[PDB]
Each structure stands twice: as C-alpha cells, then as structure tokens.
Amino acid sequence: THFDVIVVGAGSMGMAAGYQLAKQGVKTLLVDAFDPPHTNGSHHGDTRIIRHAYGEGREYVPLALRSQELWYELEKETHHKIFTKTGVLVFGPKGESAFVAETMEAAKEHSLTVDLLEGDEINKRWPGITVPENYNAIFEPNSGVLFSENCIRAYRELAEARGAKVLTHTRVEDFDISPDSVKIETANGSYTADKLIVSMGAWNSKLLSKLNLDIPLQPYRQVVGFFESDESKYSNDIDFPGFMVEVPNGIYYGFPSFGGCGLKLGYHTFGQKIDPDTINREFGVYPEDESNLRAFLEEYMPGANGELKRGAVCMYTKTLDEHFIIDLHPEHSNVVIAAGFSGHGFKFSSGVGEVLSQLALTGKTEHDISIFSINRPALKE
Ligand SMILES: *Cc1cc2c(cc1C)nc1c(=O)[nH]c(=O)nc-1n2C[C@H](O)[C@H](O)[C@H](O)COP(=O)(O)OP(=O)(O)OC[C@H]1O[C@@H](n2cnc3c(N)ncnc32)[C@H](O)[C@@H]1O
Ligand SMILES: O=C(O)[C@@H]1CSCN1
Ligand SMILES: O=C(O)[C@@H]1CSCN1
Ligand SMILES: [Cl-]
C-alpha cells in the first residue's frame, strides 16, 4: 500500500494526528518504536495538567481552549476516562514570578474565569497548602487533569476502527523524500506515502539530521513521585487542585490524589541532560530524584510528604526558547515536523493533532502557529 500519510512516532502528537486523518477517510500508516501508550517516551506517569491561562505566554491560550474542547469531545467518544476538572492553582512570591504574572495577564487578555488570592487566603481555601504570607495566587477553576495514556489509547482505538494502521515495535531508521512522495526505512520494511508527519518526541533530537535539519533539541530526564498523603486534604474528592507554582529555586507541579494513589509531584525547571537511547529509566538512581520533591513538600504541602508509593522517569525535549516547533520542513512541503514540546505540550496534543492534519493535507492551517515557526531566530545558537 502506498498510503496517503505516514506518521512516524505515534505518541502524544502523532496519535492525535492519526485520529484526525482517519476521521476524514485519509489512508494513514502510523509507525512507532514501541506500542503506545508506553513508558519509554514523554507521555506516561498517568496524568497531565491542562491550563488555559498560560504563564509561558498568552499567545498559547487559543490553542489551549481549542484543545480543551477537543478533550471533551474525546471524553464523549470513548469509554476510557479522559479529563477531570480539578482546576489549576498557580502561585509564587508576590512580585517575583514572571510565570505567575503572565498567567494573570493571559487570563485578563482572554477574559478567562479565575480567582485571585493571597497569603493566608490560599492556606484557608485549600487545607494542606502552607505558603508564606507574601505569596499570591491565581486559581483557574475550569482547567484540570488529563489521563494522558488513556488519551493516546482512545485516539489509537478510534483511528484504527476507521482504518488507520499502526505498525508497532518498529524503529524508523532513515528517510527518502522526493518532490511528490515520501519514503521511510525500517528493519521491518520500507513504506511510501504522499505526505509525512514526523513526531518522534525525544528521538527528534537524534533523527531529524536524517532530514537534513540542524535544530538545537536537548532531551531531559524528568522524574515524578507519588506520595502517601492526608486524604482528608489532598484527595480530588475534597477538591484539592492541580498546581504549577514558582518558588525561589524553580517551578514545581502536581496533582491531587485520585482514588488514594497519593499526591503526585514533579520538579519542572531541573532535569538531567540525557540521550533517549541510554537514559536510566529507574526512579531513585540519583539522590535528587526523591530529595528535590520532598524539599518542596515539607515546605508547602506538609501533609503530602509520606512514604513514596511510586516513581516514574519521563523525558522532555527542549528548544532554546522553550516554544514548540510545528511547521512544514523548509525544503519539503510534503513533510510536517512536530518537535520540541519543552515539557508543556501534552495539553495541546488534541489541538496539535488537528494542526498537523491540516498541514499534511493542505500545507496550511487555520490556526495561528507563527510562534512555532521552524525558521524563527530564537531556535538557533
Ligand atoms: C516527561 C513529562 C512530560 C510532561 C509532564 C511531566 C513529565 C514527567 N507534565 C506535563 C503536564 O502536566 N502537562 C503538559 O501539557 N505536558 C506535560 N509534559 C510534556 C508532554 O508530556 C510532552 O510535551 C509530550 O508528551 C510530547 O509528545 P510527543 O508526541 O512529542 O512525544 P511522545 O509522546 O514521547 O511520542 C513520540 C513517539 O515517537 C516514537 N518514536 C521514537 N523514535 C521513533 C522511531 N525512530 N521510529 C518510530 N517511532 C519512534 C516513540 O516510541 C513515541 O511513541
Ligand atoms: O539545554 C537546553 O535547554 C537547550 C535546548 S536545545 C540546546 N540546549
Ligand atoms: O505543562 C504543564 O502544565 C505541566 C506543569 S510543568 C510540567 N507540565
Ligand atoms: Cl516534551
């Protein structure tokens, strides 16, 4: 079969693209090194935050809101759980967080529904949080938590029912791009199509050279821990929120306990530089894994600092400016690139799937994706 479209990397972005293409009757092949969802890429550890008011930049808000609507649509189409509306709390020291400030500006610019709180008002509203009196906060009630492995599994099952094919456990090794066709090479055979979408996550850093691209991309080792917590404070059932917060030593994020799983925490602004083929995927092999998490919990969420119940090891892929790459290949209009999601892409994957399908089919998108241009100056050293 010569396909209409081949997607290389059927993860967060690729599987969403495959769903969008299959739903329009486009003959699609997706090829993945593993069998998504899996624990070797960037999409595991159960849960992902979706925010609308966006501290990385107000220009992301439209894509977040579209993505949110697409997640509700997915919820209605599958039996897997997709989204729970935890709300998202953002806080930091007053006057000392650009992230908090931009979150607040984004909410104002897009007339988002948020609550503003400070100091003891935070600790009063959410028993279990203990911030200093000089902290301030913005709480977004209508954002929340995605079950990311379920998202990918649902998109996969829906796409496959519509005739998409998923070739699993198959690494793409090389590419051959012509003006009117694309070709991939694998140990399980070679495949051709009219259009290519490249969405290989951390492996984009190693394999985009085979498309003659030289773009700084650094994979990072990013751990999360689940901790035994006071369920009377930290459970989703008592409205404990998702959160993403700035403190003097960086940004931390986390999740309420769901069904007694424990509060989940990660440290966002620090991780080890790694190669995705040699990363150590065991939690706790570095002392920082657990210690950086307990340093936050004992200070700010002291009843969520019990026994470590579970750990996970996942990867970010950062650009120099920490903005995504979503664009056509500059020399090949039949090749679409999705890369560099810099630790904050999952929430957009529904919307990005739609963009990637538009770019593959038409060479354009209705979305404004200027900030993710592959030709922008700030990508380069
Ligand atoms: C690691 C992580 C990320 C993260 C997060 C916490 C952690 C610990 N918290 C987030 C959050 O709360 N909210 C959010 O919006 N994002 C958050 N992130 C980031 C997010 O998870 C990532 O930005 C996103 O998952 C990136 O998706 P992408 O589609 O780029 O990556 P992937 O899901 O890993 O999929 C890539 C696939 O490609 C396959 N692959 C790799 N090499 C090949 C070859 N050669 N051939 C074929 N397939 C290939 C991989 O197997 C994978 O399935
Ligand atoms: O380490 C980093 O964040 C950057 C991302 S691309 C090259 N180095
Ligand atoms: O993108 C987000 O919302 C989360 C919080 S920092 C890690 N990812
Ligand atoms: Cl990432």
Residue numbers in the entry: 2 to 382
Excerpt from the publication:
Sarcosine oxidase from Bacillus sp. (SoxB) recognizes the cyclic imino acids l‐proline (l‐Pro), d‐proline (d‐Pro), and l‐thioproline (l‐Tpr) as minor substrates.
The reaction behavior varied depending on the substrates; notably, the absorption spectrum of l‐Tpr exhibited charge transfer, which was characteristic of substrate inhibition. Crystal structures of the enzyme–substrate complexes suggested that Tyr254 causes spatial interference with cyclic imino acids at the active site. A water network was also identified near the enzyme's active site, interacting with the side chain of Tyr254.
